[PDB]
């Protein structure tokens, strides 16, 4: 790196001067001689060892260039910056062949990251895109291509449009599409392409391609000028969606005419007979090689070895020199593994099954079955992509094909039928039930039973479900028809007694929570007869333990005999799941002593060791020591009986109870931190794996604490269904609300640590250092090294939409800035004290104050925050009745609290079925309405843009509350 000699030339200009500063009678005279007359440091012995250090490490030269070159450029005066820029641009064009460093923090990375630290020079944007992509420092290039775009305007349209094209193929190269599709529709001018871009990042590719062919006919003697770019979007994303939709015969004849790699790609994989036209057409394009083109070169060398045309050894050399090119494309990418790497992780599986099929049909002209099963399991995820799922079926089909052709007690493969059926199932799992359709007796009766269930055929579906049960899901579907019958018939329908005993017949026979939420509500449906209790004793133990705070309330009410029967099951089997919850309730209260007595006879040691942990937390409760005030807990883990699990693990899923982290020891630091409520006492538990788990006991717990556990419980039901789908797991939108286990009627603990500084704590941090753009100022001086700053912002705005959905749906009241916790190392945002009531009280629809709206970026506000709020709703509306099924038993414990709220009594017991059926009908008509309108004329969202346009309106913002802090 010649920046080492460029530093010493720049270091010679340093005036190496003697003052360097930052900005009993005998003893005091001895030191005063030392600390000032011997301190006296000149500038020489700082910079002179810095030379001798920088000759060893190549990172010091990068770290010292970025701090001295903006000091150097700030003395290049006026009338010489244009002379400087052209003399710098000429240097970056001076190829030293490939300017062949291509190594760690090299000259180009350290020169381009030193430009962005000094404002005033504005290097050309297609040179920044070339230097950033070819050598390294992608994020040193997005620092420059966003500085030119945002902020000031460059006062030239042709420098502003060439910047945006240089930006949009940086985002395409790093495979973030949400910033790609949000920069385009911020830019594009037609209406037919702002609709088709947004129907395509959602993922329905039938209304995407129609709005592209209806975009080009707006042109072609249309009056509109349409630009040079936005015409490379029409003719290239017509052919993107037409190969996502798998229309491979239409774009055969299209690529016959132009003639390039698109002809080699579709006609090739969608080779023994047409090898000679394919082989010579490869070698016209095999020069300038890429990781894709070597797979075509290797595979026809493999199916020439199958016919004996090509020797084996050549496939080993062709796989060896091809992998070393795949290595060079991995090394050109950034360090952190993102979605930009997933295209290379599928290349890896091609190369492993290309050196594996080179021995499956080498010893062909009982090993084949092992290879077959390994292959039947080595498949990508169900959410991965419909193209790179299809690029695996093609390969596998070709391979099994040769084996079948050569094998000419059952010799039949029938494995090409498996990879098609596995692909046909994931093709419906994505979207668009047209790609799947073009490729064991009770299931046919269940299909006819569901067909009669769609219409009004009660006896036909009952006879079909009896025909299906006489030959699984139909054992619960017949009662689901009876559940549909009981809601349709009057309040004296007896088929629900034949239904709650029906779903429990196969309840032991994963998704057991979707029927346990239906069971635990119709038992409370005014059962004065109670005949279903005998039906409950006709014939699933884990999956109740999430419903524990609902169960421990129903003991005081009716059905107390059968709800005792399902808590005696749990505490005999899982003692830690229930001991903290039954201790919070302390026969209105007398039957649980038998439950407590069952908890103490069985497992006598576990109930004894657990209460020794509770009372030591109960008695006592910048850094302090646990040794002085809680010395029993330092001596706890010596006398700690067998095992104690870390609390707050049974609230979540992980339904097998095997890998739960147990308590190892307590760290001796009580990191009390002046919080917003006051101060609390954050402890720290060390786990089995070395993972430290900082908890936080809070001393009081107001009367909402037995209600906000039910609010977080509801999104323990949505969050796993949010992770199961395709357009929601592709983007990893975890609702991130925290665990909070209660230990007592007054004391509950919950998981929080350092770097959870709330939004108001940012605000007093700024006034302590003493407008808009305050998040943009705090998070840039904190996050230097722009790779960290760009990733933290992108994870902030992607998590802010998960804050908007839970605030809009099941409407939360005025969110002050001290009620919203933001992580400082990850960006995960969650709210405390979620209290819904569920009508419009006095609100702007959500909080989007312009100290956030500047930090969002006004191009992730279109590409992330507006579509993540949609894609949450687009799954929760249509997973399995998430807006209908679960939401019954989570409002019948709200409306019984509302009657205790507005006065002391409670009424409308027979009408209580109708107060639930109304306030669930609002919550099913608050999710469903902001989903996409099924016609093709709207952009794609158009209601979440309707609400964002309301929440940023300065009329509707200042008209509301004044302690809401609607300026920050």
């Amino acid at each position: 790196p010649w920046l080492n000699q460029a530093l010493q030339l720049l270091y010679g200009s340093f005036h190496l001067d003697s003052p360097i500063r930052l900005s009993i009678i005998d003893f005091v005279a001895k030191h005063n001689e030392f600390l000032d007359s011997v301190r006296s440091l000149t500038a020489g012995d700082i910079l002179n060892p810095l030379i001798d250090i920088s000759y060893q490490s190549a990172e010091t030269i990068h770290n010292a260039w970025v701090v001295v070159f903006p000091v150097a450029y700030s003395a290049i005066e006026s009338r010489y910056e244009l002379e400087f820029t052209r003399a710098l641009v000429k240097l970056l064009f001076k190829d030293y062949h490939i300017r062949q460093q291509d190594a760690r923090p090299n000259v180009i990375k350290s020169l381009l990251d030193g430009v962005g630290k000094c404002p005033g020079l504005h290097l050309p944007p297609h040179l920044v895109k070339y230097l950033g992509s070819n050598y390294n420092a992608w994020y040193g290039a997005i620092k420059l291509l966003e500085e030119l775009s945002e902020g000031q305007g460059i006062d030239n349209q042709k420098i502003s449009d060439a910047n945006q094209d240089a930006l949009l193929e940086v985002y395409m190269s790093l495979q973030e599409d949400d910033m790609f599709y949000g920069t385009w529709r911020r830019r594009a001018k037609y209406f037919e392409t702002n609709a088709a871009l947004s129907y395509e990042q959602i993922g329905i590719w039938d209304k995407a391609l129609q709005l592209y062919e209806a975009a080009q006919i707006k042109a072609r003697s249309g009056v509109f000028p349409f630009g040079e770019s936005e015409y490379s979007l029409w003719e290239d994303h017509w052919i993107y969606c037409a190969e996502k939709l798998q229309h491979w015969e239409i774009l055969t004849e299209l690529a016959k005419h132009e003639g390039f790699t698109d002809l080699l790609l579709e006609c090739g994989w969608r080779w023994i007979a047409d090898r000679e036209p394919l082989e010579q057409s490869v070698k016209t394009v095999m020069d300038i090689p890429t990781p894709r083109r070597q797979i075509f070169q290797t595979f026809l060398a493999l199916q020439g070895f199958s016919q004996q045309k090509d020797t084996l050894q050549d496939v080993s050399r062709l796989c060896d020199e091809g992998i070393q090119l795949t290595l060079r494309k991995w090394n050109a990418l950034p360090q952190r593994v993102t979605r930009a790497h997933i295209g290379l992780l599928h290349t890896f599986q091609q190369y492993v099954e290309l050196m594996e099929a080179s021995q499956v049909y080498s010893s062909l002209v009982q090993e084949l079955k092992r290879v077959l099963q390994a292959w039947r399991e080595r498949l990508p995820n169900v959410w991965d992509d419909i193209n790179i799922w299809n690029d695996l079926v093609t390969w596998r089909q070709h391979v099994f094909g040769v084996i079948n052709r050569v094998y000419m007690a059952y010799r039949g493969y029938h494995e090409m039928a498996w990879v098609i059926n596995r692909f046909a199932h994931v093709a419906r799992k994505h979207e668009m039930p047209e790609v799947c359709i073009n490729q064991q007796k009770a299931e046919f009766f269940t299909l006819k039973g569901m067909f009669l269930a769609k219409l009004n055929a009660k006896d036909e579906a009952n006879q079909a479900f009896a025909t299906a049960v006489q030959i699984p899901k139909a054992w619960a579907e017949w009662g689901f028809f009876n559940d549909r019958r009981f809601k349709e018939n009057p309040e004296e329908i007896f088929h629900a007694k034949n239904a709650i005993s029906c779903y429990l017949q196969a309840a032991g026979l994963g998704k057991t929570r979707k029927l346990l939420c239906r069971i635990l509500w119709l038992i409370s449906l005014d059962d004065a007869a109670g005949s279903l209790a005998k039906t409950f004793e006709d014939h699933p133990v884990w999956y109740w333990i999430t419903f524990v705070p609902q169960l421990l309330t129903s003991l005081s009410h009716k059905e107390a005999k059968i709800v005792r029967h399902i808590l005696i099951q749990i505490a005999k089997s899982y003692p830690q799941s229930l001991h903290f919850q039954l201790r919070t309730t302390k026969q209105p209260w007398q039957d649980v002593e038998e439950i407590m007595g069952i908890l103490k006879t069985a497992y006598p040691l576990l109930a004894l060791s657990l209460e020794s942990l509770v009372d030591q937390l109960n008695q006592r409760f910048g850094k302090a020591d646990l040794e002085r005030v809680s010395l029993h807990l330092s001596l706890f883990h010596h006398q700690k009986f067998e095992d104690i699990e870390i609390p707050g693990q049974y609230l979540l899923h992980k339904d097998n109870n095997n890998h739960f982290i147990k308590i190892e020891r307590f760290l001796p630091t009580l990191d009390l931190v002046r919080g917003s409520n006051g101060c609390y006492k954050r402890m720290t538990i060390r786990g089995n794996d070395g993972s430290l788990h900082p908890f936080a006991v809070q001393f009081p717990a107001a009367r909402h604490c037995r209600r906000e556990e039910r609010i977080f419980q509801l999104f323990r039901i949505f969050d796993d269904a949010l992770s199961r789908k395709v357009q929601s797991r592709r983007r990893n939108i975890s609702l991130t609300l925290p665990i909070a286990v209660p230990l007592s009627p007054h004391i509950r603990i919950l998981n929080d640590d350092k770097r959870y500084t709330t939004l108001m704590g940012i605000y007093e941090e700024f006034c302590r250092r003493k407008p808009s753009t305050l998040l943009k100022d705090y998070y840039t001086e904190k996050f230097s090294n722009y790779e960290n700053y760009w990733l933290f912002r992108k994870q902030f705005t992607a998590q802010y939409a998960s804050f908007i959905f839970m605030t809009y749906i099941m409407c939360i009241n005025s969110r002050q800035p001290q009620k919203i916790h933001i992580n400082e190392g990850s960006g995960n945002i969650w709210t405390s004290e979620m209290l819904p009531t569920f009508y419009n009280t006095e609100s702007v629809p959500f909080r989007l104050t312009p100290n956030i709206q500047k930090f969002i970026g006004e191009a992730g506000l279109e590409g992330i925050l507006s579509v993540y709020i949609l894609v949450i709703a687009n799954s929760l509306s249509d997973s399995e009745f998430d807006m209908e099924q679960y939401l019954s038993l989570f409002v019948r414990d709200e409306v019984i609290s509302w009657f205790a709220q507005q006065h002391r009594a409670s009424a409308q017991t027979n009408q209580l079925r109708e107060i639930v059926r109304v306030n669930v009908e609002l919550l099913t008509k608050r999710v469903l309405q902001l989903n996409h309108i099924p016609n093709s004329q709207n952009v794609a969202t158009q209601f979440v843009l309707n609400l964002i346009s309301q929440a940023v309106n300065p009329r509707n913002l200042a008209y509301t509350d004044s302690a809401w802090m609607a300026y920050l």
């Binding site: 060892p49 920088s54 070393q324 190369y351 995820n381 006398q639």
Partner: protein, 1012 residues
């Protein structure tokens, strides 16, 4: 030598396998057990590494299923707490034992989990044990299933794929690792990108990243511009602590580091009149990293004269801040790494800096009492106290080393160290608790001795029983509620301290714990048993077997669990299971042996049950469970139908079956400690093994490693403890010995030469009365002179020394004249004590006369070779002990008497023993005396003139050493020399005839040519 031995079994999948195979179970476990108590513990881990490398793809390794869960939890518990001793990556030796255990992955490898955190240490920071780390990762991807292996790696899946991605690099990097990693990330297909998540470790401007701004002055920019003077601080820390780069970069890294450090130090505003004042957040973790590299620079040569120069500066600087803040701490966190470091130079500078924070603090204020009210001397107490409660092992070592100097420099006000009495000891019990047994014991050895020596130090002042109200009894009530628990080093020292606590301030130990003894018992009685698993069930007994060792405590109602005990006796985890029953013996053995309690229980059938179960345990399946059970029966000796019932299972094991294991043999030997027909029975027991077709098949196998020999020697051990009758088993037992050596073809040594000797210790008179009769025979008397020379026959040597001259009479009364046997007898007991030789002289010439008789018959060419090596090695043994007599007296005229007595044999006396003994009489007015005696004895011309010539090696080397180390003949004999040889007459040397006499006359000519 272990490298030479373990590579032999890799050379032979053969008979060279079963000889090493049983030893390596001991050689591993005794290398773990020695590494916690050694001076350099790393050689015990180099040993197992050459054991694991020298085998691979081996035979079965079937003895590794039992030591594996204790070898992993030893290695994973000190791969955390080890940070590069000299600088050798000694954490990279623990991983290479952890990853290369030589077993099969199928059943043994499951439970490997322990291997996931050392997996990422091998991939990330290594160089060619990366290839070891990738090899085990490839094995566990394709063999295992995704439903089992995926939940294992979830804590470190996000950390293994950062270290796997540093290996994908092109052909300048390896083609070996970069192609292996691509196969691992492909062979799992969709599980590659199932971990790809939003990141969490965004580095938010850490401590060495801290842009500190020094104001510079440059020529273009006409102002005082600030720049970050830390772009190389990341490369300064990593260069100063590596021995691999050159010294010039390492010295420059210090000038950088001290260059930034002096800018923080001198920037603080000093006081205007500090003498008049005397009469009246992210920096503070950067400075600790800065001041620590200053402390490490002491360990560097040619710069420690400069790094010490400001270490003494900054410790002086940080006390005047607090003495100016009395109207209103990075050195202490920097001291505790100097105390806990490795090199002796940096450790001593930690010890010099803790003095200078006191030796200057006495210089400043003077009054030490007011220099403890608010001084920084008070806060380095609670820094050393608190860091004993730390997680890591090395910070516990700082608070134990820092405290033991803080009690030997603050010695003067010990009244301060009585208000902090309980807070120190509770901090010093805690370091005994959460320290692993496999860590080295230097943190616990300085913690055991510090509780012991301090309570002898600041508790030599308490008066009497009246002042025991609250303060001292709360100290006693702390170290008696920590009596019943596991981790016996906190259980043994709770008794060692409480003994010396009550040694001084002389109070009975039962009366000391008396007002709180009922508080201890109540947990230990409440839950009796069947809870509190087997680590606790040794602790519940241990508080009670100590409590009944008092003068009186709890004379009633221990019988609620005394049943409970007998039945736990009556029925690794197998290690603690035999450790469980070995302590229930000691509780039961102290139940009966103590008086005034056995008469109290004797109304409801208690002692009987104890005795009966103590039996049935005598035939147990272990060895050490019998030894403590043997101690219980030997303590209750101070019934008969139960003795016949006990002898019924004993005689059933003693049946003539030739299948008695060694466990029943030592139990039989323990039985005779507390008729004579078994001697007739046990001789025919061994003779089943002692047929020659069971020993000729042995032939040349080693005897100590063999298993059929251990049954033979354990049979021979029982004869030490026979009935005390005058045993006729003297002749046939020794005839069983001589028969057992000839069929083994093994002379001069055998492992069953030792238990034959302890029998001879029992009968000294019957032994020698057997040996003295058959004394002329050679092959049995050779075993005698080994038995006398053994140190275990202390009673046999007293017999042969008192009855010495009766075997001398054998030599006066023809091929069986065994001169040769008597020489090795007298040599064997002269090596016993060097005091026996000083008085025997008529013995020693009587040996040499009859030896010279034997060298007349042996000098005869009538037969071919009569030179028997018993006779000639008799003389080479006689002569080296005849010199052992000479260096006990100072007389220089006895050595010239050995000469004429050996004239018929060997000419000049034997080399390597006497030519270096004349050379210590040659090398003072006694050197003049020896030359008087030579001219006296030499005119005995009948002394065979090759002895007369032989003084050429004893006369002239005196003078040519005197005339070389002194000037020229500076030091009697000359008056006597000239008397006879220069007045000599005709018959002697003054004639003239060419004979061999002229070889003597050259001793006379070459002496006179030296006198002139």
């Amino acid at each position: 030598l272990f490298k030479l031995c373990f590579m032999s079994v890799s050379l032979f999948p053969a008979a060279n396998e079963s000889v090493i195979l049983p030893h390596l179970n001991e050689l591993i476990l005794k290398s773990l057990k020695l590494s916690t108590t050694a001076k350099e513990p790393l050689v015990y881990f180099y040993l197992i590494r050459t054991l694991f490398r020298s085998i691979g793809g081996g035979r079965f390794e079937n003895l590794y299923k039992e030591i594996m869960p204790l070898l992993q939890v030893l290695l994973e518990s000190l791969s955390k707490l080890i940070h590069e001793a000299r600088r050798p990556q000694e954490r990279d030796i623990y991983v290479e034992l952890c990853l290369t255990v030589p077993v099969r992955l199928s059943v043994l490898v499951p439970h490997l989990s322990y291997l996931m955190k050392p997996l990422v240490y091998a991939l990330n920071g290594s160089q060619e044990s990366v290839s070891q780390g990738l090899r085990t990762l490839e094995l566990c991807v394709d063999n295992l299933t995704a439903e089992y292996f995926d939940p294992i790696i979830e804590p470190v899946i996000d950390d293994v794929m950062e270290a796997l991605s540093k290996h994908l690099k092109p052909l300048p990097y390896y083609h070996q690792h970069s192609h292996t990693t691509l196969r691992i990330l492909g062979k799992l297909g969709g599980r590659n990108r199932t971990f790809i998540k939003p990141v969490d470790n965004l580095k938010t401007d850490s401590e060495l990243f801290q842009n500190v701004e020094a104001m510079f002055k440059i020529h273009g920019l006409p102002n005082e511009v600030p720049l970050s003077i830390t772009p190389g601080l990341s490369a300064a820390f990593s260069l100063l602590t590596d021995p691999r780069p050159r010294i010039h970069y390492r010295i420059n890294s210090f000038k950088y580091i001290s260059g930034i450090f002096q800018l923080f130090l001198g920037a603080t505003q000093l006081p205007d009149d500090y003498a008049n004042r005397l009469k009246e957040d992210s920096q503070m973790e950067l400075l600790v990293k800065l001041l620590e590299s200053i402390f490490y620079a002491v360990s560097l040569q040619e710069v420690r004269e400069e790094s010490k120069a400001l270490i003494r500066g900054t410790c002086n600087h940080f006390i005047l801040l607090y003495f100016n803040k009395m109207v209103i701490n990075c050195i202490f966190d920097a001291i505790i790494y100097a105390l806990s470091s490795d090199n002796s130079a940096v450790r001593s500078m930690g010890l010099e800096s803790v003095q200078l924070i006191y030796d200057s603090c006495v210089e400043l204020f003077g009054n030490i009492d007011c220099a403890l009210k608010f001084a920084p001397l008070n806060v380095m107490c609670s820094k050393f106290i608190h860091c004993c409660f730390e997680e890591p092992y090395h910070k516990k070592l700082a608070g134990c080393i820092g405290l033991e100097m803080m009690l030997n420099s603050l010695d003067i006000p010990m009244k301060y160290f009585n208000a902090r009495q309980l807070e120190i000891i509770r901090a010093l019990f805690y370091v005994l608790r959460d320290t692993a047994p496999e860590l080295p014991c230097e943190v616990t050895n300085t913690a055991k001795r510090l509780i012991l020596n301090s309570l002898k130090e600041w508790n030599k002042e308490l008066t009497r029983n009246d002042v025991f109200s609250s303060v001292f009894q709360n100290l006693v009530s702390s170290l008696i509620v920590d009596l019943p628990n596991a981790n016996e080093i906190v259980r043994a020292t709770a008794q060692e301290a409480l003994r010396t606590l009550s040694e001084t301030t002389q109070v009975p130990i039962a009366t000391m714990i008396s007002p709180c003894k009922h508080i201890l018992l109540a947990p230990i009685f409440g839950k009796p048993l069947r809870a509190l698993p087997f680590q606790m069930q040794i602790g519940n007994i241990d508080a009670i077997t100590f409590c009944m060792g008092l003068e009186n405590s709890f004379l009633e109602y221990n019988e609620e669990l005394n049943r409970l005990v007998q039945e736990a006796l009556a029925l690794k985890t197998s290690e603690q299971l035999v450790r469980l029953r070995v302590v229930c013996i000691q509780l039961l053995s102290l139940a009966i042996t103590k008086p005034e309690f056995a008469a109290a229980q004797q109304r409801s059938n208690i002692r009987v049950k104890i005795l009966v179960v103590f039996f049935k345990s005598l035939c147990g399946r272990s060895i050490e469970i019998i030894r403590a059970a043997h101690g219980g029966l030997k303590a209750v000796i101070d019934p008969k139908e139960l003795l016949q019932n006990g002898l019924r299972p004993m005689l059933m094991n003693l049946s003539d079956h030739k299948k008695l294991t060694v466990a029943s043999l030592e139990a039989l030997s323990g039985l005779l400690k507390l008729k004579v027909g078994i001697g007739s029975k046990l001789l025919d027991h061994l003779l089943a093994w002692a047929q020659p077709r069971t020993l000729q098949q042995l032939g040349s196998q080693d005897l100590e490693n063999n298993s059929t020999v251990q049954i033979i020697v354990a049979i021979l051990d029982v004869f030490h403890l026979l009935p005390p009758t005058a045993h006729k088993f003297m002749n046939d037992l020794m005839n069983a010995l001589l028969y057992l050596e000839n069929n083994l073809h093994r002379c001069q040594y055998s492992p069953f030469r030792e238990p034959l000797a302890k029998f001879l210790d029992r009968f000294p008179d019957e032994s020698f009365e057997y040996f003295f009769n058959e004394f002329s025979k050679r092959e049995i008397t050779t075993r005698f002179v080994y038995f006398v020379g053994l140190d275990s026959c202390s009673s046999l040597r007293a017999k042969v020394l008192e009855s010495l001259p009766r075997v001398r009479g054998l030599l006066h009364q023809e091929k069986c004249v065994r001169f040769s046997n008597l020489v090795d007898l007298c040599e064997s007991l002269a090596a016993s004590d060097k005091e026996w030789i000083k008085d025997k002289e008529e013995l020693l010439g009587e040996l040499l006369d009859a030896g010279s008789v034997c060298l007349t018959l042996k000098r005869s060419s009538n037969v071919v070779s009569p030179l028997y090596f018993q006779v000639d090695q008799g003389f080479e043994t006689l002569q080296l002990l005849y010199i052992e007599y000479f260096k006990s007296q100072p007389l220089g005229h006895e050595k010239v008497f050995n000469f004429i007595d050996k004239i018929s044999k060997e000419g000049l006396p034997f080399v390597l023993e006497f030519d270096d003994f004349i050379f210590n009489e040659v090398v003072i007015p006694t050197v003049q005396q020896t030359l008087d005696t030579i001219i006296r004895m030499t005119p005995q011309v009948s002394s065979l003139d090759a002895r007369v010539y032989l003084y050429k090696r004893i006369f002239l080397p005196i003078c040519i050493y005197e005339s070389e180390m002194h000037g020229d003949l500076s030091r009697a004999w000359l008056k006597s020399f000239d008397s006879d040889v220069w007045k000599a007459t005709g018959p002697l040397v003054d004639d003239y005839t060419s004979t061999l006499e002229d070889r003597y006359r050259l001793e006379l000519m070459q002496l006179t040519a030296l006198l002139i």
